[PDB]
């Protein structure tokens, strides 16, 4: 496990391949602009097409640049806010 699993339970019901059409993708519900801005195209075209480990790698960069408050509720559910 990782802290990100609690975020992904909150954001995606633990399904890191979710792609529901709501403007967000994968286990931590990146939007496409954030996926691309934090290096995600190196792994896959969208977050939901990347593995959990790759999504977590991009999420780490995203959290460092933008803060846990980018997931204002689900990062709290994981104990990080």
Structural domains present in the chain: 1-81 (1.10.530.10)
- Tokens 């403007």: give the residue: 23
Residue 63 token pair: 């959290």
27 CB-contact burial (10 Å; exposed 0-12 / middle 13-18 / buried 19+): buried
Radius of gyration of the chain (CA): 11
Residue 6 token pair: 């609690």
CA 23 – CA 11 distance, rounded (Å): 13
CA 54 – CA 31 distance, rounded (Å): 15
Angle subtended at Cα 66 by Cα 5 and Cα 73, rounded to the nearest 5 degrees: 45
Q: Which residues pair with 30 in a beta bridge?
A: 25
Query: Three-state SS for 31?
Result: coil
CB 75 within 8 A of CB 68: yes
44-66 in b/e form (b: 16+ CB < 10 A) is bebbbbbebebbbbbbeebbeee
CA 39 – CA 59 distance, rounded (Å): 10
Q: Name which of 57, 29, 28, 27 is nearest 41 in CA terms.
A: 57
Q: Resolution in angstroms, to 1 decimal, for this deposition?
A: 1.2
The coordinates were experimentally obtained by X-ray
């Amino acid at each position: 496990g990782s802290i990100w699993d609690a975020i992904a339970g909150c954001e995606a019901g633990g399904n890191w391949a979710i792609n529901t059409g709501n403007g967000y993708y994968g286990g931590v519900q990146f939007d496409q602009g954030t996926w691309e801005a934090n290096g995600g195209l190196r792994y896959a075209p969208r977050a939901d097409l990347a593995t959990r480990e790759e999504q977590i790698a991009v999420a780490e960069v995203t959290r460092l640049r933008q803060g846990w408050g980018a997931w204002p509720v689900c990062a709290a559910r994981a104990g990080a806010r």
